[PDB]
Tab-separated table of C-alpha atoms in Angstrom:
chain	number	residue	atom	x	y	z
A	2	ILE	CA	-3.606	14.982	19.959
A	3	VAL	CA	-3.494	12.941	23.175
A	4	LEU	CA	-6.039	10.429	24.482
A	5	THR	CA	-6.855	10.130	28.177
A	6	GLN	CA	-8.750	7.093	29.382
A	7	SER	CA	-10.959	6.771	32.491
A	8	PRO	CA	-10.726	4.982	35.718
A	9	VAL	CA	-7.208	3.525	35.890
A	10	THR	CA	-8.544	0.429	37.661
A	11	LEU	CA	-12.031	-1.105	37.659
A	12	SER	CA	-11.731	-2.797	41.055
A	13	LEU	CA	-15.153	-4.414	41.353
A	14	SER	CA	-16.776	-7.827	41.395
A	15	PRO	CA	-16.801	-10.394	38.572
A	16	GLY	CA	-19.966	-11.286	36.703
A	17	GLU	CA	-21.725	-7.910	36.422
A	18	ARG	CA	-21.910	-4.670	34.400
A	19	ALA	CA	-18.890	-2.414	33.811
A	20	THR	CA	-18.379	0.666	31.617
A	21	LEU	CA	-15.111	1.769	29.983
A	22	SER	CA	-14.680	5.248	28.514
A	23	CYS	CA	-11.959	7.098	26.580
A	24	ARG	CA	-12.179	10.879	27.108
A	25	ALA	CA	-10.167	12.285	24.203
A	26	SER	CA	-8.474	15.653	24.705
A	27	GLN	CA	-8.937	16.604	21.041
A	28	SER	CA	-11.882	15.522	18.889
A	29	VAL	CA	-11.252	12.197	17.150
A	30	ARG	CA	-11.702	12.579	13.409
A	31	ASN	CA	-14.020	10.170	11.548
A	32	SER	CA	-14.724	8.218	14.802
A	33	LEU	CA	-11.704	5.880	14.697
A	34	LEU	CA	-11.111	4.875	18.311
A	35	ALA	CA	-10.768	1.093	18.062
A	36	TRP	CA	-10.642	-0.814	21.363
A	37	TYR	CA	-7.966	-3.410	22.159
A	38	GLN	CA	-7.244	-5.584	25.169
A	39	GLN	CA	-3.796	-6.848	26.180
A	40	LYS	CA	-3.283	-9.440	28.891
A	41	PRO	CA	0.035	-8.519	30.529
A	42	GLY	CA	3.080	-9.527	28.518
A	43	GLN	CA	1.357	-11.068	25.494
A	44	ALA	CA	0.065	-9.978	22.109
A	45	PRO	CA	-2.889	-7.557	22.058
A	46	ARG	CA	-5.977	-8.313	20.024
A	47	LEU	CA	-8.829	-6.268	18.623
A	48	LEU	CA	-12.384	-6.094	19.961
A	49	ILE	CA	-14.017	-2.927	18.589
A	50	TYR	CA	-13.178	-1.465	15.179
A	51	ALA	CA	-14.224	1.943	13.777
A	52	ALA	CA	-15.115	2.958	17.380
A	53	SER	CA	-18.426	1.061	17.421
A	54	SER	CA	-18.334	-2.126	15.327
A	55	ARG	CA	-17.741	-5.607	16.706
A	56	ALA	CA	-14.745	-7.384	15.218
A	57	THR	CA	-14.877	-10.471	13.024
A	58	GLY	CA	-14.271	-13.687	14.950
A	59	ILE	CA	-14.826	-11.904	18.270
A	60	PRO	CA	-17.985	-13.055	20.108
A	61	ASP	CA	-20.599	-10.892	21.843
A	62	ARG	CA	-20.646	-9.124	25.273
A	63	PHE	CA	-18.603	-6.114	24.059
A	64	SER	CA	-20.053	-2.907	22.606
A	65	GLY	CA	-18.532	0.297	21.277
A	66	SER	CA	-20.865	3.275	21.351
A	67	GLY	CA	-20.778	6.973	20.567
A	68	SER	CA	-18.639	9.052	18.246
A	69	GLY	CA	-16.547	12.199	18.262
A	70	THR	CA	-15.176	12.716	21.763
A	71	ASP	CA	-17.717	11.133	24.122
A	72	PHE	CA	-17.064	7.417	23.950
A	73	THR	CA	-17.984	4.161	25.644
A	74	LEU	CA	-16.758	0.590	25.702
A	75	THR	CA	-19.589	-1.543	27.063
A	76	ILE	CA	-18.614	-4.894	28.558
A	77	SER	CA	-21.607	-6.968	29.583
A	78	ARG	CA	-20.541	-10.110	31.441
A	79	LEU	CA	-17.158	-10.050	33.206
A	80	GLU	CA	-15.753	-13.550	32.961
A	81	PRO	CA	-12.482	-14.176	34.871
A	82	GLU	CA	-10.503	-13.987	31.609
A	83	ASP	CA	-11.847	-10.455	30.966
A	84	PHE	CA	-9.748	-9.083	33.849
A	85	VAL	CA	-7.317	-7.569	31.381
A	86	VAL	CA	-5.752	-4.193	30.524
A	87	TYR	CA	-7.903	-2.510	27.843
A	88	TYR	CA	-6.626	0.046	25.333
A	89	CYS	CA	-7.870	2.880	23.100
A	90	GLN	CA	-6.567	3.862	19.610
A	91	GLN	CA	-6.689	7.006	17.500
A	92	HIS	CA	-5.781	5.836	14.238
A	93	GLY	CA	-7.606	8.390	12.504
A	94	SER	CA	-5.688	11.599	12.803
A	95	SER	CA	-2.367	11.547	10.988
A	96	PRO	CA	0.532	10.825	13.225
A	97	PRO	CA	0.729	9.654	16.862
A	98	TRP	CA	-2.242	7.253	16.619
A	99	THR	CA	-2.095	7.669	20.305
A	100	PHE	CA	-3.167	4.848	22.616
A	101	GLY	CA	-4.406	5.210	26.195
A	102	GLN	CA	-2.990	4.598	29.637
A	103	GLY	CA	-5.105	1.463	29.813
A	104	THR	CA	-6.970	0.336	32.882
A	105	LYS	CA	-6.985	-2.697	35.165
A	106	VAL	CA	-10.179	-4.728	35.281
A	107	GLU	CA	-9.658	-6.020	38.826
A	108	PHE	CA	-11.611	-8.405	41.079
B	2	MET	CA	-4.030	-14.684	8.383
B	3	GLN	CA	-0.961	-14.749	10.639
B	4	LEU	CA	2.006	-12.387	10.981
B	5	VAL	CA	5.046	-14.434	11.965
B	6	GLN	CA	7.605	-12.083	13.491
B	7	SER	CA	11.319	-12.643	14.005
B	8	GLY	CA	12.842	-13.803	17.272
B	9	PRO	CA	14.490	-11.717	19.990
B	10	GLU	CA	17.755	-9.865	19.426
B	11	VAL	CA	19.976	-9.111	22.413
B	12	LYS	CA	21.825	-5.937	21.457
B	13	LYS	CA	24.117	-3.155	22.715
B	14	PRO	CA	23.496	0.605	23.246
B	15	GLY	CA	25.641	1.505	20.227
B	16	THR	CA	24.193	-0.961	17.730
B	17	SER	CA	20.998	-0.974	15.657
B	18	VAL	CA	18.200	-3.531	15.483
B	19	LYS	CA	16.605	-5.163	12.426
B	20	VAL	CA	13.102	-6.476	13.155
B	21	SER	CA	11.304	-8.342	10.377
B	22	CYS	CA	7.667	-9.412	10.228
B	23	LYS	CA	6.552	-11.937	7.607
B	24	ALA	CA	2.874	-12.351	6.701
B	25	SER	CA	1.846	-16.009	6.471
B	26	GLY	CA	-1.273	-17.432	4.860
B	27	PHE	CA	-1.767	-14.540	2.416
B	28	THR	CA	-0.004	-11.855	0.397
B	29	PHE	CA	0.274	-8.127	1.023
B	30	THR	CA	-2.442	-6.038	-0.553
B	31	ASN	CA	-2.901	-2.333	0.316
B	32	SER	CA	-2.934	-3.399	3.928
B	33	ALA	CA	-1.265	-0.631	6.039
B	34	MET	CA	0.808	-2.352	8.724
B	35	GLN	CA	1.609	-0.419	11.906
B	36	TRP	CA	4.340	-1.057	14.485
B	37	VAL	CA	3.802	-0.950	18.255
B	38	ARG	CA	6.619	-0.830	20.833
B	39	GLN	CA	5.817	-2.007	24.365
B	40	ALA	CA	8.299	-1.392	27.142
B	41	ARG	CA	7.427	-3.968	29.788
B	42	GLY	CA	5.288	-2.535	32.564
B	43	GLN	CA	4.308	0.452	30.397
B	44	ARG	CA	1.566	1.199	27.889
B	45	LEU	CA	1.713	0.356	24.212
B	46	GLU	CA	3.302	3.019	22.019
B	47	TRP	CA	3.369	3.896	18.328
B	48	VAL	CA	6.478	3.591	16.175
B	49	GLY	CA	5.301	4.017	12.617
B	50	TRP	CA	3.229	2.585	9.825
B	51	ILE	CA	3.814	1.413	6.252
B	52	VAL	CA	1.315	1.412	3.482
B	53	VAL	CA	2.735	-1.898	2.277
B	54	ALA	CA	1.736	-1.546	-1.385
B	55	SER	CA	3.132	1.984	-1.616
B	56	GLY	CA	5.998	1.883	0.856
B	57	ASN	CA	5.065	5.314	2.229
B	58	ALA	CA	6.378	4.904	5.758
B	59	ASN	CA	5.641	7.494	8.426
B	60	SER	CA	7.206	7.341	11.882
B	61	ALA	CA	6.256	9.005	15.154
B	62	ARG	CA	7.715	12.284	16.387
B	63	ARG	CA	10.085	10.902	19.017
B	64	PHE	CA	11.167	8.343	16.378
B	65	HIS	CA	11.263	10.892	13.546
B	66	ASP	CA	14.876	10.536	12.411
B	67	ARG	CA	16.221	7.124	13.452
B	68	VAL	CA	13.787	4.413	12.365
B	69	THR	CA	13.186	3.431	8.742
B	70	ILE	CA	10.221	1.132	8.352
B	71	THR	CA	10.535	-0.654	5.011
B	72	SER	CA	8.364	-3.236	3.290
B	73	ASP	CA	8.819	-5.773	0.509
B	74	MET	CA	5.872	-7.099	-1.478
B	75	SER	CA	7.935	-9.729	-3.317
B	76	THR	CA	8.708	-11.754	-0.184
B	77	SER	CA	5.475	-10.625	1.565
B	78	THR	CA	7.411	-9.097	4.444
B	79	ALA	CA	7.713	-5.743	6.186
B	80	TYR	CA	10.833	-4.741	8.058
B	81	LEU	CA	11.950	-2.301	10.751
B	82	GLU	CA	15.368	-1.026	11.789
B	83	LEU	CA	15.755	1.367	14.720
B	84	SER	CA	18.949	3.379	15.079
B	85	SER	CA	21.279	3.864	18.075
B	86	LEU	CA	19.276	1.488	20.361
B	87	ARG	CA	19.414	3.416	23.641
B	88	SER	CA	18.907	1.976	27.121
B	89	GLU	CA	15.287	3.189	27.039
B	90	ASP	CA	14.475	0.902	24.086
B	91	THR	CA	14.238	-2.518	25.784
B	92	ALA	CA	10.750	-3.502	24.729
B	93	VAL	CA	8.514	-5.857	22.751
B	94	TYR	CA	7.772	-4.798	19.179
B	95	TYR	CA	4.433	-5.699	17.621
B	96	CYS	CA	3.601	-5.683	13.913
B	97	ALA	CA	-0.134	-5.050	13.560
B	98	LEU	CA	-1.913	-5.476	10.240
B	99	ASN	CA	-5.256	-4.281	8.893
B	100	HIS	CA	-7.116	-7.112	7.162
B	101	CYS	CA	-8.162	-6.328	3.591
B	102	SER	CA	-11.220	-8.116	2.318
B	103	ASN	CA	-10.328	-7.561	-1.371
B	104	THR	CA	-13.465	-5.643	-2.319
B	105	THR	CA	-12.307	-3.281	0.398
B	106	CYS	CA	-10.186	-3.183	3.543
B	107	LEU	CA	-11.129	-3.073	7.230
B	108	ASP	CA	-10.649	-0.125	9.585
B	109	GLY	CA	-8.975	-2.084	12.375
B	110	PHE	CA	-5.528	-3.522	13.096
B	111	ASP	CA	-6.855	-6.971	13.866
B	112	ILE	CA	-4.145	-9.498	12.920
B	113	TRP	CA	-1.049	-8.802	15.015
B	114	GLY	CA	2.377	-10.420	15.349
B	115	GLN	CA	3.795	-12.181	18.377
B	116	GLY	CA	6.526	-9.867	19.645
B	117	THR	CA	10.273	-9.279	19.467
B	118	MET	CA	12.167	-8.884	22.750
B	119	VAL	CA	14.619	-6.246	21.540
B	120	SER	CA	17.010	-6.285	24.494
B	121	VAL	CA	19.453	-3.430	25.070
B	122	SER	CA	22.285	-4.892	27.145
C	2	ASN	CA	3.741	10.406	-47.734
C	3	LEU	CA	5.155	8.491	-44.783
C	4	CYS	CA	3.393	7.762	-41.520
C	5	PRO	CA	4.888	9.816	-38.657
C	6	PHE	CA	6.511	7.061	-36.634
C	7	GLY	CA	9.520	9.340	-36.177
C	8	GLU	CA	7.569	11.660	-33.900
C	9	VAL	CA	6.439	8.724	-31.743
C	10	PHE	CA	9.420	6.405	-31.455
C	11	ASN	CA	12.184	9.027	-31.596
C	12	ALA	CA	10.243	11.515	-29.465
C	13	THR	CA	12.020	13.604	-26.847
C	14	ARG	CA	9.566	12.941	-24.019
C	15	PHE	CA	6.995	10.266	-23.221
C	16	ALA	CA	4.104	10.184	-20.751
C	17	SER	CA	3.478	8.118	-17.631
C	18	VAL	CA	1.484	4.914	-17.860
C	19	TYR	CA	-1.643	6.157	-16.066
C	20	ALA	CA	-1.936	9.045	-18.553
C	21	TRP	CA	-0.735	7.004	-21.511
C	22	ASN	CA	-0.376	9.076	-24.664
C	23	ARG	CA	-2.540	7.879	-27.556
C	24	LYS	CA	-2.075	9.280	-31.058
C	25	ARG	CA	-4.196	8.267	-34.035
C	26	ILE	CA	-2.257	7.519	-37.218
C	27	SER	CA	-4.104	7.511	-40.540
C	28	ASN	CA	-4.026	8.746	-44.158
C	29	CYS	CA	-0.417	7.692	-44.701
C	30	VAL	CA	1.873	4.853	-45.735
C	31	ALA	CA	3.206	2.973	-42.706
C	32	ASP	CA	6.753	1.752	-43.357
C	33	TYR	CA	7.429	-0.907	-40.714
C	34	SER	CA	10.880	-1.901	-42.012
C	35	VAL	CA	12.548	0.935	-40.085
C	36	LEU	CA	10.858	-0.423	-36.944
C	37	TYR	CA	11.668	-4.134	-37.221
C	38	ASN	CA	15.148	-3.655	-38.709
C	39	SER	CA	16.117	-0.867	-36.293
C	40	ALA	CA	17.935	-3.408	-34.035
C	41	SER	CA	17.329	-1.224	-30.967
C	42	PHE	CA	13.927	-2.452	-29.730
C	43	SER	CA	14.592	-5.143	-27.135
C	44	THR	CA	11.054	-6.450	-26.592
C	45	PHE	CA	8.980	-6.880	-29.746
C	46	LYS	CA	6.439	-9.561	-30.670
C	47	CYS	CA	3.152	-9.387	-32.525
C	48	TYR	CA	-0.324	-10.753	-31.891
C	49	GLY	CA	-2.865	-11.598	-34.578
C	50	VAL	CA	-0.491	-10.935	-37.489
C	51	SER	CA	3.141	-11.802	-38.123
C	52	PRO	CA	5.402	-8.712	-37.879
C	53	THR	CA	7.044	-9.359	-41.253
C	54	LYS	CA	3.598	-10.024	-42.771
C	55	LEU	CA	1.796	-6.858	-41.604
C	56	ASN	CA	3.923	-4.676	-43.911
C	57	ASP	CA	1.766	-5.459	-46.962
C	58	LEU	CA	-1.665	-5.411	-45.292
C	59	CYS	CA	-3.801	-2.294	-44.963
C	60	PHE	CA	-5.784	-1.087	-41.938
C	61	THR	CA	-8.114	1.844	-41.322
C	62	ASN	CA	-7.100	3.331	-37.956
C	63	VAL	CA	-3.801	2.831	-36.128
C	64	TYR	CA	-3.352	3.975	-32.527
C	65	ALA	CA	0.166	4.270	-31.099
C	66	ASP	CA	-0.340	4.196	-27.336
C	67	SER	CA	2.956	5.089	-25.676
C	68	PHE	CA	4.139	5.154	-22.065
C	69	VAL	CA	7.098	4.481	-19.759
C	70	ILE	CA	7.081	1.494	-17.403
C	71	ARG	CA	9.624	-0.378	-15.337
C	72	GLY	CA	11.316	-3.256	-17.134
C	73	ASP	CA	9.711	-6.006	-15.049
C	74	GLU	CA	6.109	-5.417	-16.158
C	75	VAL	CA	6.771	-5.325	-19.893
C	76	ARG	CA	5.258	-8.825	-19.729
C	77	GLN	CA	2.179	-7.161	-18.198
C	78	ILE	CA	1.548	-5.407	-21.545
C	79	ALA	CA	-0.045	-8.445	-23.181
C	80	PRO	CA	-3.560	-9.685	-23.989
C	81	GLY	CA	-4.971	-11.997	-21.340
C	82	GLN	CA	-2.529	-10.802	-18.687
C	83	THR	CA	-3.186	-10.040	-15.018
C	84	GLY	CA	-1.073	-7.820	-12.787
C	85	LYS	CA	-0.728	-4.211	-11.637
C	86	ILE	CA	-0.192	-2.209	-14.837
C	87	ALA	CA	-2.441	-4.626	-16.742
C	88	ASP	CA	-5.295	-4.011	-14.280
C	89	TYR	CA	-5.034	-0.472	-12.904
C	90	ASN	CA	-2.958	1.415	-15.485
C	91	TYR	CA	-3.254	0.059	-19.039
C	92	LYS	CA	-5.197	-3.074	-20.002
C	93	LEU	CA	-5.040	-4.689	-23.425
C	94	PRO	CA	-8.162	-6.552	-24.595
C	95	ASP	CA	-8.102	-10.269	-25.315
C	96	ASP	CA	-8.869	-9.642	-29.011
C	97	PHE	CA	-5.872	-7.307	-29.358
C	98	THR	CA	-4.963	-6.677	-33.010
C	99	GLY	CA	-1.610	-4.939	-33.062
C	100	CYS	CA	1.617	-5.134	-31.131
C	101	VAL	CA	4.036	-3.769	-28.599
C	102	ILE	CA	7.491	-2.215	-28.928
C	103	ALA	CA	9.598	-1.813	-25.791
C	104	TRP	CA	13.228	-0.728	-25.653
C	105	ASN	CA	15.550	0.194	-22.809
C	106	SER	CA	15.678	3.880	-21.911
C	107	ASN	CA	18.104	4.031	-18.981
C	108	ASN	CA	20.272	6.544	-20.862
C	109	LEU	CA	17.429	9.097	-21.116
C	110	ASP	CA	14.722	8.599	-18.484
C	111	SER	CA	16.707	7.494	-15.407
C	112	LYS	CA	18.399	10.723	-14.337
C	113	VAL	CA	20.984	11.152	-11.596
C	114	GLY	CA	19.550	11.199	-8.083
C	115	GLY	CA	16.255	9.581	-9.056
C	116	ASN	CA	13.547	10.359	-11.605
C	117	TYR	CA	10.087	10.763	-10.071
C	118	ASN	CA	8.171	12.320	-12.970
C	119	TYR	CA	6.764	8.933	-14.005
C	120	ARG	CA	3.995	7.579	-11.781
C	121	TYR	CA	1.719	4.567	-12.035
C	122	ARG	CA	-1.747	3.955	-10.648
C	123	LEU	CA	-1.389	1.633	-7.663
C	124	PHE	CA	-4.699	1.721	-5.771
C	125	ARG	CA	-7.982	1.464	-7.645
C	126	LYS	CA	-11.485	0.230	-6.884
C	127	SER	CA	-11.873	-1.926	-10.002
C	128	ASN	CA	-9.713	-3.236	-12.808
C	129	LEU	CA	-9.635	-1.149	-15.964
C	130	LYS	CA	-11.683	-1.875	-19.035
C	131	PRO	CA	-9.443	-2.177	-22.132
C	132	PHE	CA	-8.035	1.061	-23.596
C	133	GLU	CA	-9.266	3.159	-20.671
C	134	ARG	CA	-7.358	6.315	-19.739
C	135	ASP	CA	-7.824	7.255	-16.076
C	136	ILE	CA	-6.653	10.744	-15.134
C	137	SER	CA	-8.368	11.263	-11.748
C	138	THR	CA	-6.020	11.628	-8.768
C	139	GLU	CA	-8.662	11.498	-6.042
C	140	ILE	CA	-7.592	10.165	-2.651
C	141	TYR	CA	-8.532	6.487	-2.734
C	142	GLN	CA	-10.716	5.112	0.059
C	143	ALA	CA	-9.819	1.574	1.121
C	144	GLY	CA	-12.056	1.310	4.186
C	145	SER	CA	-15.599	1.984	5.345
C	146	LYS	CA	-15.362	5.586	6.537
C	147	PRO	CA	-14.797	8.119	3.728
C	148	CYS	CA	-12.111	10.685	4.477
C	149	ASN	CA	-13.120	13.594	2.169
C	150	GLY	CA	-9.936	13.798	0.100
C	151	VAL	CA	-7.405	14.254	2.905
C	152	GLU	CA	-4.385	12.010	3.402
C	153	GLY	CA	-4.393	9.528	6.254
C	154	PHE	CA	-5.232	6.016	7.372
C	155	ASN	CA	-7.007	4.127	4.548
C	156	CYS	CA	-6.640	7.321	2.472
C	157	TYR	CA	-4.019	6.637	-0.192
C	158	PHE	CA	-3.006	8.825	-3.094
C	159	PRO	CA	-3.228	6.294	-5.941
C	160	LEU	CA	-0.158	7.419	-7.935
C	161	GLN	CA	3.118	6.046	-6.565
C	162	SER	CA	6.072	7.455	-8.487
C	163	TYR	CA	8.742	5.114	-9.817
C	164	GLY	CA	12.209	5.437	-8.377
C	165	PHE	CA	14.362	5.413	-11.509
C	166	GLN	CA	18.115	5.400	-10.895
C	167	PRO	CA	21.130	4.548	-13.086
C	168	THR	CA	22.319	2.393	-10.160
C	169	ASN	CA	19.198	0.199	-10.568
C	170	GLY	CA	19.291	-3.235	-12.147
C	171	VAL	CA	18.138	-4.315	-15.585
C	172	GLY	CA	14.651	-5.198	-14.354
C	173	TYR	CA	14.281	-1.792	-12.681
C	174	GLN	CA	15.354	0.282	-15.642
C	175	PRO	CA	12.706	2.390	-17.416
C	176	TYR	CA	11.519	0.992	-20.746
C	177	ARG	CA	9.782	3.313	-23.189
C	178	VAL	CA	6.882	1.190	-24.420
C	179	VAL	CA	4.936	1.962	-27.597
C	180	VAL	CA	1.814	-0.113	-28.256
C	181	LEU	CA	0.354	-0.256	-31.762
C	182	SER	CA	-3.299	-1.182	-32.247
C	183	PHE	CA	-4.989	-1.924	-35.567
C	184	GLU	CA	-8.566	-2.109	-36.821
C	190	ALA	CA	-8.591	1.772	-45.079
C	191	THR	CA	-5.999	4.534	-45.426
C	192	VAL	CA	-3.046	3.031	-43.509
C	193	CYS	CA	-1.326	0.873	-46.131
C	194	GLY	CA	2.261	-0.245	-46.685
C-alpha cells in the first residue's frame, strides 16, 4: 500500500483558499490518514487525526474531510507561517504506514 | 508531554547506532511509539513502531532484519539500534508518540521528539 | 480424612494468572503444619488471622486460587494493592480473609530457550473486581475507531507472554503462587 499526494507545489498567493488532497493507491482501512506539517529541517507536528478530527492544542483554519480513498485537507487562511511541507499518514494498515511525497505551499 | 531524544552520533559505515528517546512529564502507558527517519531533502519515512507496554516491535520491510526497536517501561524510555549504518542512512530520526488519555488513547502521533542527526562519516 | 493440599501445592502443572485455577476445598481436615513447616515457601504471610493460629479455627469454604507470576509482582498479590496483576489479572479484595503462598519455581517452569506458556493480561478497559476470572482474548481497542478483531494500530492482543529463562535474575524467575481464601466443615 502506497500513498500518492496531489499537487507537488501549491504556488499561489497568501491569504486565500487552498485545498490539499491525498489520493491513496489502495483503500485506507478505518480512515486513518492523519495530516502532518513539517517546516524544513525541524520536527513535524500533527494537525488532523483519524483523517478528519482537529488535534488538541491546534487552533482552527484546518479541516480534514472524507474517508476511504477520496480525501481532503482544507486550509482556510494561508498565513505566511503556513507555507510549509504537508504530509499524509497511513497508520491504519499494518506495516509501511506510508507517508506522502509532501507538497510545497509556495507564495 | 515531551519526548526528549538523545543527541547526534557521528558514526562510520561499519558501526551501529543506538538512538534513545526518553518520555518526560509522564510515564509510558499502552502508547505505541513509532520511529520516523528523515534523510535531509527527502520525505519522512517509517522505521518501525513499539507497543511500549507490550514490547511488540515491528519494523518496515527495507529495515526488516537490521533494526531492533526496544522499549523499557521502568525508565520510561524507548530505544532504537540500527545495524551496519550504510552511507544511505545519514538522516534525522524522530520518535513519535500517541497520547493516551487514560480512559482511552488517541489515534494520532501528536507528541514527537526533536531529532537525532545520525551521521554516517 | 485430610484436605487435598498435596494435589494443589505439589501439583505437576499450574495455570497462568489470567486464567487462575480456583479449587474449592471442603468437608475435610486442613493440616496446615505441613505448609508452614515445609521450609520451601519463600513468600508467606497471613492477613486477618495469624498463620500459627489458623490451625485450630474452623471455616466453611476454602478456595485455593493458584497461578504462576514473575517474582517481582508477588507484592502485587496483596489486599489494597495497585499494579498490573492486581488490576488486570487477579485482584484481592480489601477484606481478604486468607493468605498467600509463593515459592520459587525456576527449576520447573523456566525451561531452556524460554517458556512462553504463561501469559498475563496486560491491556484491559477497567480494573478487575475482586476474584474475577477473565478468559476473553478479544483484540483490545485503545482508540476511537474499532478494528473488528484484527491486529494493528491501537489493536492489541491483551495477553503478553512472560519470557521465562534460567538465565534471568531472581526477580524475573517464575514463582508458583497459591492463594488461600477463607469464609463449617474445614476444621483442623
